[PDB]
Amino acid sequence: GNSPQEEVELKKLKHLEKSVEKIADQLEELNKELTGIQQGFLPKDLQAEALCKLDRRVKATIEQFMKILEEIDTLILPENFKDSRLKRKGLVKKVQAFLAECDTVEQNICQ
Amino acid sequence: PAVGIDLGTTYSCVGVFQHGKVEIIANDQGNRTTPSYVAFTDTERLIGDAAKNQVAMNPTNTVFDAKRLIGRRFDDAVVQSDMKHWPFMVVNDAGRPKVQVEYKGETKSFYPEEVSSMVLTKMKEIAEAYLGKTVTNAVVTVPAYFNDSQRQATKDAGTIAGLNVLRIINEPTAAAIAYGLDKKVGAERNVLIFDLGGGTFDVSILTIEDGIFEVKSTAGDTHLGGEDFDNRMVNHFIAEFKRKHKKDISENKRAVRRLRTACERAKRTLSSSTQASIEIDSLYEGIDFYTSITRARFEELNADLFRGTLDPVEKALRDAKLDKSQIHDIVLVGGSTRIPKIQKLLQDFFNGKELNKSINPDEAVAYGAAVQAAILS
Numbered sequence: 360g361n362s363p364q365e366e367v368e369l370k371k372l373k374h375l376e377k378s379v380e381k382i383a384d385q386l387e388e389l390n391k392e393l394t395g396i397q398q399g400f401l402p403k404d405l406q407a408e409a410l411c412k413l414d415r416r417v418k419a420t421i422e423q424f425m426k427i428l429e430e431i432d433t434l435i436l437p438e439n440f441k442d443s444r445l446k447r448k449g450l451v452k453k454v455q456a457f458l459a460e461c462d463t464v465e466q467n468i469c470q
Numbered sequence: 471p472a473v474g475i476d477l478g479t480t481y482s483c484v485g486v487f488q489h490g491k492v493e494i495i496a497n498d499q500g501n502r503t504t505p506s507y508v509a510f511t512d513t514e515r516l517i518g519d520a521a522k523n524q525v526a527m528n529p530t531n532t533v534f535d536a537k538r539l540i541g542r543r544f545d546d547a548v549v550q551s552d553m554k555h556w557p558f559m560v561v562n563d564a565g566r567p568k569v570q571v572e573y574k575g576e577t578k579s580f581y582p583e584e585v586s587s588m589v590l591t592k593m594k595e596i597a598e599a600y601l602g603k604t605v606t607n608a609v610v611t612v613p614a615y616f617n618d619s620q621r622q623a624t625k626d627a628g629t630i631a632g633l634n635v636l637r638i639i640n641e642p643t644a645a646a647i648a649y650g651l652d653k654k655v656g657a658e659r660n661v662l663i664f665d666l667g668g669g670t671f672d673v674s675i676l677t678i679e680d681g682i683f684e685v686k687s688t689a690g691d692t693h694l695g696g697e698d699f700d701n702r703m704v705n706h707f708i709a710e711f712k713r714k715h716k717k718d719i720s721e722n723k724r725a726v727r728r729l730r731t732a733c734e735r736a737k738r739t740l741s742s743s744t745q746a747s748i749e750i751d752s753l754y755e756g757i758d759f760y761t762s763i764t765r766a767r768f769e770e771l772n773a774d775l776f777r778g779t780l781d782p783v784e785k786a787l788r789d790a791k792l793d794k795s796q797i798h799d800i801v802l803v804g805g806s807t808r809i810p811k812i813q814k815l816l817q818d819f820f821n822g823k824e825l826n827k828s829i830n831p832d833e834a835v836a837y838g839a840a841v842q843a844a845i846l847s
């Protein structure tokens with residue numbers, strides 16, 4: 360059944376998959392710094408300052424993920440575009456898993 | 471070179487009349503309008519799209535709606551009312567509002583015209599980047615209901631930005647000029663300007679005699695615009711989701727935001743097609759939401775609001791001491807005037823009269839400002 364048009368949708372989805380990887384990496388970088396910071400080297404007031412700069416960054420990461428979801432939500436895929444449908448659903452779930460990860464951090468620091 | 475600037479509450483737009491036609495100028499992101507937003511960070515000042523993009527990350531140091539404050543007294547009913555909504559601090563400085571923020575980790579206060587000057591600086595830089603030439607001369611627009619204090623504060627914003635403000639002109643006047651309604655020969659003309667945006671609705675009646683303008687009346691609704699139409703759709707789909715899935719998405723801010731963004735886009739689709747589809751995977755608790763809405767359903771959901779736009783119109787006519795048959799020209803401005811039903815209700819109200827609507831209703835004010843800037847240059 361494979362149609363040339365599904366190629367166009369599959370390409371769009373791959374580009375979104377790469378964007379998601381770029382953001383996921385920011386989250387991994389964030390988490391690595393967090394451990395270093397919390398590892399108690401700075402005075403408590405300066406540690407708090409650093410943790411709030413990190414909190415602001417996790418909020419940027421959440422918003423970047425939300426923007427990706429909004430872009431994915433503009434797609435309309437026929438029932439027969441099974442490959443495209445599976446890739447769309449799979450990518451949404453991935454993003455939601457990464458948002459759960461951001462929320463854990465967000466709701467632990469700079470309370 | 472001379473430019474026209476529509477300095478808007480939520481968005482601004484800049485045009486230039488060159489080689490016999492107005493060019494609306496795209497910003498650095500390619501956008502023909504720019505968010506009237508200013509952000510202060512640890513390292514820098516952001517204006518426009520970049521400032522709007524990072525609202526969520528930095529909402530206390532990101533300023534918008536400076537037009538709701540410019541030239542007003544701190545104790546103005548408008549300033550008092552809006553404050554409770556804005557996440558940024560609005561300070562009382564000897565009876566005049568200033569915005570207070572952190573900027574490169576130091577606390578700073580700005581008057582509204584200072585914030586609007588930053589928006590104008592951006593619009594100036596936008597024109598300069600396009601023209602590849604310095605740009606100094608501008609016409610800048612304001613609402614027809616602006617008093618002396620608001621007009622002077624607007625002019626001052628321009629001056630602070632390094633602009634030679636040739637003239638401050640009313641928004642409905644610029645829209646009339648865009649359509650060349652002042653070039654029409656004959657006797658006195660009565661013009662209705664119907665301006666419906668994302669948040670606000672303004673109606674204005676002007677008379678033009680011999681190319682010369684007068685404001686006869688103003689009316690409107692502070693709490694009516696495209697956001698209100700989106701909300702009616704949002705509530706329609708939240709009820710649908712509860713009906714099919716017996717789950718309440720309304721407490722999940724991210725689900726409701728996904729739905730809301732999809733609804734606003736489907737609305738825009740319904741201005742040119744008679745149906746719109748939406749597919750949101752995993753909207754709430756893993757449940758996919760696939761749905762459609764017809765233009766007629768959308769119209770039905772907003773039937774009171776849409777018909778309601780005729781009340782300010784009637785009001786404006788009473789105040790202008792005119793009969794609806796004494797209106798010669800009607801001009802649509804504002805992005806929500808693209809809705810077919812609104813155009814039909816209005817075209818019917820004026821017993822079948824034609825509407826001036828061919829110029830992009832988001833750009834028409836800038837467009838008239840640019841025509842007049844080249845005239846005054």
Ligand SMILES: Nc1ncnc2c1nc(NCc1ccc3ccccc3n1)n2[C@@H]1O[C@H](CO)[C@@H](O)[C@H]1O
Binds near residue numbers: 697734806808
């Ligand atoms: N066809 C349209 N039909 C109904 N409403 C429309 C509309 N175009 C815009 N606005 C222009 C617009 C807005 C977002 C866009 C996004 C992508 C591409 C083009 C866009 N164009 N609006 C509403 O005007 C208010 C002020 O804009 C908002 O309530 C908005 O809904």
